[PDB]
């Protein structure tokens, strides 16, 4: 591999919590050169269709700064035509966060998750999910400490990683080159207890077999468990009660 | 099941080719009440980034009429803010069509695929892919018959189907109700020779196991093979040469 | 004429009701190669400015699929700048439908008419009006049969046709060629009892006389009456009470 | 009539040329309280589809200031969703201007007509057409005087007026009240020699007869001829050669 | 100077009130060839965030017609992407008008100011502010005369002018040429009693000293006082009570 | 002051260069809780209107993340209507950067500056300018070190700060509270040698005197010089040749 990494090896991972002051939860996660600021803010309101249903909500906003993959990713602002890529990814991150939380116990308020990619070199949506969880868990713990809510209704850890087939090799966590050169690539969103929340496999003008898929899904779940072992170092949990550990940052031994 | 269908049973399927006159290929496919007009038009031009690269292209447009799921699906026209759902699906259909075709041999021209959902009751994007293939194959055969191209560079059949977990039951080809009530749902895009082109599994606030995924992927691939046995009745192929059979319509025995 | 049609002769006309299941009324009408799916759906609500005024409403949505006139008509979706043509036509269809219905007796609900041009070869807006009426009448009859409303408040049939001056010849129902080559062209919307609902005559860089207009309006009203004789075969009316006849399709003898 | 005007009587008309300095032609026309600034600017270029075809072009832009009909007409600027009304009208004005000019002899340049309604009380699109002609004629005369073009290729005068049926009375040139209260209303665009360029009659939930249409078209053509007698006082023409007369303003005796 | 004007000399100024009938206040102001229609309309409502706060509001809309600086300024209508220039200026005009008025005493209604540039040759936003004040004062006087409000809560006159450094010369009120050629340029908004409401100085790729700024601010305040001496001829004020004088127009001796 | 800061005292300032790897220049600057990521990327191209003019260009993009002032600042992406605030600020930052650089010597390429506010508590546009300069200087030094350009054509340092009048007190560098409570507020952009690049003073429904302006401009220029003394610690300059110093971060003693 271009960087000298094994085929079943993650890039150097780093998760820093309390990155910013204002959001209830926030962090800067990085998978190699891919860097994402993930923040979680509580809005004391709910989407109209939920009003009165004794439940809370989580929704996400994703944006890539114009300096992605050392190129130009001019945001949707001073442009006009917004892309469906951003929405596909925003919908994914929202689905991951809500699966990890028992919204019944959050109350009628919304956790607004913002993922801001400040440097892109592949796996940005998987870095974003992994980081967004840390920010959501932190924000729920913060709401609890403030007395806004009774417990910390977090069901389990959530992380994500990419994997793919490149020159007939199955690689874990692809950077931008490996991915533009991939025959097949996929994103997997797994949980702390080994289950799956989401999996998308796409043949890029190449088809694949159910067995190749399984081979990739197995390699991905291993990556997901390594990222989750990192996230775990940031919390102290017991009987569904979550407290932050004393770490402000965690990184892989790589 | 609400309709009295088995759990591993497709709804009544129908594929009608030559639905319209003007497009090089066209058909009206239906999975139950879900109905989609799929057309394929040749534009004698290529996207700027391809110009000169001795290759052709296929891209898709998807639109849902305002009377979907017996509700209101007001198109993006007299509205303003276009959704990322449409783009996610348009990107999927394009990926499926290009995997099935050797674009090298199409020449510098584009096959513009249009999928128009005229009635929606779930599985609309999978009906669209299944129908779009018929229209693309027909359009390539038509281009050949006209002498615009030498051969009929179609690699293999492509079809798609949905499957999901509803009240802990794994069901094939979900209608709109079963899907809004699903714990997990997925779309699978397979090929004629049993391979896979795409698979997306989404936990809808529920997580799932690798084994449940496999169980679903197995049921889906069976559905894909039944839809492809139907598509097959519409062509007579030998050594990579494609001709239309004499059927103008094909339907399942259901 | 290119097709061998007389100068005062309509193309082959066909109207098929019950085209789709979900809408309260629906049909597929065709004037030659021009084909339009017209559906009518009841939305149990009214536009804010009407709320409380003991009346119902009818409004229309028109869209041309990207394969019009065997060319490219990329909808307003994945584009951005919506055209005034579509709105001009949507406003026309709405005006025609409301003239034909006593909205007082529909109740505070809206009949949402959707006209989807699936193949264009001229006269598409006139085919749409002619077909939209069938779908609206059917939807009102359906609402009555369901007991949502007391009577079937339909005032009279409504149909429309184009006519024009081409190489100093006055032709009825123009296809796309004749129209792009026309010196003057017009669209006329008439009723069952011989009256007019709308007439638009446009000199296309040529001016015309009041007498030429009358000559054209006379030829148009004859076309309108032939289309209405067709629509009539689809209903059995007596003293303002409307029931569908047993025909599911009607076509001209041409 | 509310203002004490006869039924076949125009409101006080006023046309002032040379309203502004910069445009090649410009004027401020007024039909009662309806006031429109019409300007005509020459852009030394042509629309891409015309390039090389030895011809010029005329296109129009229409805008209503936010203080129309003593209400609020917030332009499309700081808004977002542009209306089809504006485009319908812009297309009309363009069609009227091009019918009046032999574009062959203008050269490859464009006359950009701008109609800015600074006060609206009905008949604004007909005031705009009437005024736009004066500005176009002036701009063509100006181009000739400058030597940019050989002759003054103006075919004939063009003017427009509205008429309608209100409480079963046929009225000429409707103000905003009479028009919102009208059963049928129409706009007619006629030429200097008595011919027609455009006519649009719309039943506003009322139908009408061919005879009523003729009655209205006759009253309109009389109005068109009165407006054109005014426009005529502004030019001195002979054998197709146009010069401005010495009037800077013309008004009706009313 | 190109026009033969002194360096500390305004162009010919003209302010005409009662330009239009419908708005409560209106005028046509001109600084040389720069011409702006400024109108002020009362909307019997307030912005949602003010509702109930016993106060009124003033907001402005600015638009440049397509024939600005004898070029093309195609409005935001039939375009799509609205510019930040317009908003910057609209925000400025609003700030100027609200500083001049005691909104407490206007009641819960809004004065909607519209500035329509019908000819541009520099200083258009400063002409607009100067003219908008006249229209706002007139509209408040009009509301008083109608009994809608008790007093005429106008705090003081407001006017604005531009100034700049061109080839190391400090010039007052720049036309379009002088401004595109300027090293530094600024807009100043002053009041009747000699105070300032706004000042923006921009180095156009050149920097300047605090002293040069003061030199420019001094020249500007003199220009502001001359424009205000003109505005003053249009009112008769005593103890905070405002009445219009008998002038309908005022111009400078120049 | 709320934070215990003197009236003529900046908040704690921090500038960190080499914040990210990919951009040619980049930094994270902070004025208190206001934090901005400023990056500078070289695009090997120029805006069409410059092509061939032997010059380079600098343009800026500004965006505020949705968690500004501990509230909601949903970017223009998944929205639709872009604000003029962003453009006003983007235009300012561009003007500041180009004043500081001799574009003649950059070659036909563009330095694309991106300012991403990741936390807002007032003075965000002034923090952005101050930080953007560091990123631009670094990017020009980087281009030189790579041999893309001969020299380092940087004319002088550029920084900016806000100041205002709050309860009749003149305060330097306002946070969000002080600013929403200000009677007058201003932004000043100064250079390394004591000159000015830009100054905007706005009365917020209060007017001010030329003397108050000067008092504020004097306090601002002192703030600008303190920020520039910080920036200076990051470079080693001699005879127009710029090299980075060994500091990767600089902060104020506060």
Q: How far apart, in whole angstroms, are the C-alpha atoms of residue C31 and residue C17?
A: 15
Is E3 a domain residue?
A: no
Q: How far apart, in whole angstroms, are the C-alpha atoms of residue B106 and residue B118?
A: 30
Contacts (Cβ under 8 Å, ≥6 apart) of B164: B170, B171, B174, B178, B179, B182, B183, B184, B185, B186, B216
Query: Which residues constitute the domain of residue E184?
Result: 12-254
Beta bridge partners of A35: A30, A119
Beta bridge partners of F203: F184
Name subunits touching D (3+ CB pairs < 8 A).
Answer: C, E
- Whether B80 and chain A come into contact, CB under 8 Å, resolves to no
A77 closest CB neighbour out of F33, F66, F75: F75
Tokens of C94: 């709405």
SS3 B9: coil
Tokens of A41: 């803010």
Name subunits touching F (3+ CB pairs < 8 A).
Answer: A, E
Number of residues that this document lists for chain E = 254
- Partners of C80 on chain B (C-beta within 8 Å) are 82
SS3 B8: coil
Contacts (Cβ under 8 Å, ≥6 apart) of E158: E96, E97, E99, E100, E129, E130, E133, E189, E190, E191, E192, E197
Q: How determined?
A: X-ray
Q: How far apart, in whole angstroms, are the C-alpha atoms of residue D164 and residue D167?
A: 10
Measure the CA angle with vertex B190, ends B188 and B191; round to 5°: 170
Burial annotation B6-42 (CB, 10 A radius, 16+ → b, else e): eeebbbebbbbbebbebbbbbbbbbbbbbbbbbbbbb
- Residues F170 and F7 sit within 8 Å (Cβ to Cβ): yes
Is D1 a domain residue?
A: no
Taking CA–CA distances from E101, the nearest residue in chain F reads F205
SS3 D254: coil
Q: How far apart, in whole angstroms, are the C-alpha atoms of residue D214 and residue B158?
A: 61
Q: How far apart, in whole angstroms, are the C-alpha atoms of residue F66 and residue D181?
A: 49
Radius of gyration of chain D (CA): 18
- Residues D63 and D86 sit within 8 Å (Cβ to Cβ): yes
Please state, in angstroms and as integers, the Cα–Cα distance from residue D70 to each residue in C8, D201, D247, E20, following that order. 48, 26, 32, 11
Taking CA–CA distances from D217, the nearest residue in chain C reads C210
Contacts (Cβ under 8 Å, ≥6 apart) of C14: C28, C29, C30, C249, C250, C251, C252
Do A65 and F114 lie within an 8 Å CB cutoff?
Answer: yes
Tokens of C228: 């209405």
Indicate the helix (H) or strand (E) that contains B210: helix B210-232
- Partners of A33 on chain F (C-beta within 8 Å) are 21-22
The 10 Å Cβ neighbour count of residue F89 is: 25
Burial annotation C192-228 (CB, 10 A radius, 16+ → b, else e): beebbbbbbbbbbbebbebebbeebbebbbebbbbbb
For F214, what's the count of Cα atoms within 13 Å in the CB-facing half-sphere?
Answer: 13
Tokens of F57: 């260009």
Tokens of B205: 């606030």
For F240, what's the count of Cα atoms within 13 Å in the CB-facing half-sphere?
Answer: 9
SS3 E12: coil
Q: Whose CA is closest to F96, among F113, F82, F109?
A: F113
- Residues C62 and C68 sit within 8 Å (Cβ to Cβ): no
Please state whether beta strands A110-119 and A57-64 pair in parallel, antiparallel, or not at all (unpaired).
parallel
- Whether E55 and chain F come into contact, CB under 8 Å, resolves to no
Q: How far apart, in whole angstroms, are the C-alpha atoms of residue D167 and residue E70?
A: 48
Is D3 a domain residue?
A: no
Main-chain phi, psi angles of C140, to 5 degrees: -75, -35
- Residues D108 and D46 sit within 8 Å (Cβ to Cβ): yes
- Whether D67 and chain E come into contact, CB under 8 Å, resolves to yes
Number of folded domains that form chain D: 1
Name subunits touching C (3+ CB pairs < 8 A).
Answer: B, D
Do A82 and F77 lie within an 8 Å CB cutoff?
Answer: yes
Those of residues 219-248 in D touching chain E at CB distance below 8 A are: none
Do F78 and A90 lie within an 8 Å CB cutoff?
Answer: yes
- Residues B156 and B149 sit within 8 Å (Cβ to Cβ): no
- Partners of A82 on chain B (C-beta within 8 Å) are 81-82, 84
- Whether B95 and chain A come into contact, CB under 8 Å, resolves to yes
How far away is chain E from the Cα of F180, in angstroms, using its nearest Cα? Answer: 15
Do A199 and B195 lie within an 8 Å CB cutoff?
Answer: no
Q: How far apart, in whole angstroms, are the C-alpha atoms of residue B195 and residue F35?
A: 51
Q: Look up tokens 């070190």; give the residue.
A: F145
Q: Whose CA is closest to E72, among C82, B55, D112, C122?
A: D112
Name subunits touching E (3+ CB pairs < 8 A).
Answer: D, F
What does chain C look like in DSSP terms, one character per residue? Answer: -TTS--TT----EEEEES-SSSSSEEEEEEETTEEEEEEEEEES---TTTTTSS--EEEEEEEE-S-BTTS----STTT----HHHHHHHHHHHHHHHHHB-GGGG-S-EEEEEEEEEEBSS-HHHHHHHHHHHHHHHHHHHHHHTTSSSS--B---EEEEEEEEETTEEEES--HHHHHT-SEEEEEEEETTS-EEEEEEEESS--B-HHHHHHHHHHHHHHHHHHHHHHHTTEEEETTEEEE-S-SEEE---
Q: What is the DSSP letter of A240?
A: T
Q: How far apart, in whole angstroms, are the C-alpha atoms of residue D29 and residue D13?
A: 7
Tokens of B123: 């599985």
Tokens of C252: 């001209």
Measure the CA angle with vertex D66, ends D62 and D68; round to 5°: 80
Contacts (Cβ under 8 Å, ≥6 apart) of E180: none
Is D126 a domain residue?
A: yes
Q: How far apart, in whole angstroms, are the C-alpha atoms of residue A93 and residue A79?
A: 24
- Partners of B77 on chain C (C-beta within 8 Å) are 61, 63, 75-77, 82, 86
Taking CA–CA distances from C209, the nearest residue in chain D reads D195
Contacts (Cβ under 8 Å, ≥6 apart) of B80: C82, D80, D81, F80
C21 closest CB neighbour out of B66, B75, B119: B119
Backbone torsion region of residue F99, taken as left when φ is above 0, otherwise alpha when ψ lies between -120 and 50, otherwise beta: alpha
Taking CA–CA distances from E215, the nearest residue in chain F reads F210
Please state, in angstroms and as integers, the Cα–Cα distance from residue C221 to each residue in A131, C137, C190, following that order. 69, 21, 7
Q: Look up tokens 């090799």; give the residue.
A: A169
- Residues F152 and F241 sit within 8 Å (Cβ to Cβ): yes
SS3 D132: helix
Rounded to an integer, what is the distance from CA E235 to the centroid of its chain? 17
End-to-end CA distance of chain E: 15
Measure the CA angle with vertex B183, ends B178 and B185; round to 5°: 70
Q: Give me the resolution in angstroms, 1 decimal.
A: 2.3
Q: How far apart, in whole angstroms, are the C-alpha atoms of residue A58 and residue A46?
A: 9
Q: What is the largest CA-CA distance in chain A?
A: 55
What does chain F look like in DSSP terms, one character per residue? Answer: -TTS--TT----EEEEES-SSSSSEEEEEEETTEEEEEEEEEES---TTTTTSS--EEEEEEEE-S-BTTS----STTT----HHHHHHHHHHHHHHHHHB-GGGG-S-EEEEEEEEEEBSS-HHHHHHHHHHHHHHHHHHHHHHTTSSSS--B---EEEEEEEEETTEEEES--HHHHHT-SEEEEEEEETTS-EEEEEEEESS--B-HHHHHHHHHHHHHHHHHHHHHHHTTEEEETTEEEE-S-SEEE---
Tokens of B213: 């995924």
Tokens of F84: 């003029």
User: Where do the H-state alpha helices sit in chain D?
Assistant: 84-100, 124-145, 176-180, 210-232
Q: How far apart, in whole angstroms, are the C-alpha atoms of residue F17 and residue F228?
A: 15
Q: How far apart, in whole angstroms, are the C-alpha atoms of residue B146 and residue B243?
A: 13
Q: How far apart, in whole angstroms, are the C-alpha atoms of residue B18 and residue B248?
A: 7
Q: How far apart, in whole angstroms, are the C-alpha atoms of residue B208 and residue B186?
A: 12
Beta bridge partners of B38: B27, B115
- Whether A81 and chain F come into contact, CB under 8 Å, resolves to no
- Residues F93 and F117 sit within 8 Å (Cβ to Cβ): no
Rounded to an integer, what is the distance from CA D96 to the centroid of its chain? 8
Radius of gyration of chain A (CA): 18
- Residues C151 and C240 sit within 8 Å (Cβ to Cβ): yes
Is D79 a domain residue?
A: yes
Q: Whose CA is closest to A119, among A169, A58, A71?
A: A71
How far away is chain D from the Cα of E147, in angstroms, using its nearest Cα? Answer: 19
Helices E124-145 and E84-100 cross at an angle (nearest 10°) of: 40
- Partners of D197 on chain C (C-beta within 8 Å) are 203, 207-208
SS3 D106: helix
- Residues A136 and A115 sit within 8 Å (Cβ to Cβ): no
Is C58 a domain residue?
A: yes
Does the CA dihedral D177-D180-D186-D188 come out positive or negative?
A: positive
Q: How far apart, in whole angstroms, are the C-alpha atoms of residue E86 and residue A78?
A: 15
CATH code: domain of residue F191:
3.30.230.70
What does A172-239 look like in DSSP terms, one character per residue? Answer: ES--HHHHHT-SEEEEEEEETTS-EEEEEEEESS--B-HHHHHHHHHHHHHHHHHHHHHHHTTEEEET
How far away is chain F from the Cα of A22, in angstroms, using its nearest Cα? Answer: 5
Do A213 and B204 lie within an 8 Å CB cutoff?
Answer: no
Contacts (Cβ under 8 Å, ≥6 apart) of D39: D19, D20, D23, D25, D26, D27, D113, D114, D116, D135, E65, E67
Tokens of D233: 């006082």
Do D203 and C197 lie within an 8 Å CB cutoff?
Answer: yes
What does B154-193 look like in DSSP terms, one character per residue? Answer: B---EEEEEEEEETTEEEES--HHHHHT-SEEEEEEEETT
- Residues F12 and F254 sit within 8 Å (Cβ to Cβ): yes
Q: What is the DSSP letter of A88?
A: H
- Tell me the helix, strand and coil percentages in chain A, rounded to 5: 30, 35, 40
B and C: number of Cβ contacts within 8 A? 95
Is D2 a domain residue?
A: no
- Residues C244 and C235 sit within 8 Å (Cβ to Cβ): yes
Rounded to an integer, what is the distance from CA E59 to the centroid of its chain? 13
Q: How far apart, in whole angstroms, are the C-alpha atoms of residue F245 and residue B4?
A: 77
Q: How far apart, in whole angstroms, are the C-alpha atoms of residue D187 and residue D123?
A: 8
């Amino acid at each position: 591999r271009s960087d000298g990494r094994k085929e079943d090896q993650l890039r150097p991972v780093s998760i820093q919590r309390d990155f910013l002051e204002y959001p209830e939860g926030s962090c800067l996660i990085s998978f190699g050169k891919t860097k994402v600021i993930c923040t979680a803010s509580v809005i004391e309101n709910v989407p109209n269709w939920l009003k009165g249903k004794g439940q809370g909500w989580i929704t996400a906003e994703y944006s890539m700064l114009p300096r992605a993959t050392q190129q130009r990713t001019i945001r949707e602002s001073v442009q006009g035509r917004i892309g469906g890529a951003t929405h596909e990814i925003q919908r994914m991150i929202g689905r991951a966060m809500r699966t990890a939380v028992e919204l019944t116990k959050i109350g009628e308020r919304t956790i607004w998750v913002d993922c801001d990619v400040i440097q892109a070199d592949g796996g940005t949506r998987t870095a974003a999910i992994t980081g967004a969880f840390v920010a959501v868990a932190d924000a729920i713990i913060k709401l609890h400490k403030e007395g806004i809510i009774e417990e910390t209704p977090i069901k389990d850890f959530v992380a994500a990683v990419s994997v793919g087939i490149v020159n007939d090799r199955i690689l874990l966590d692809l950077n931008f080159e490996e991915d533009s050169a991939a025959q097949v690539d996929m994103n997997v969103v797994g949980t702390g207890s080994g289950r799956l929340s989401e999996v998308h496999t796409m043949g890029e003008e190449y088809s694949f077999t159910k067995d190749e898929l399984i081979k990739m899904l197995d390699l991905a779940q291993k990556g997901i468990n390594e990222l989750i072992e990192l996230q775990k170092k940031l919390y102290v949990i017991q009987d569904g009660k979550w407290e932050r550990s004393e770490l402000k940052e965690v990184s892989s031994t790589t």
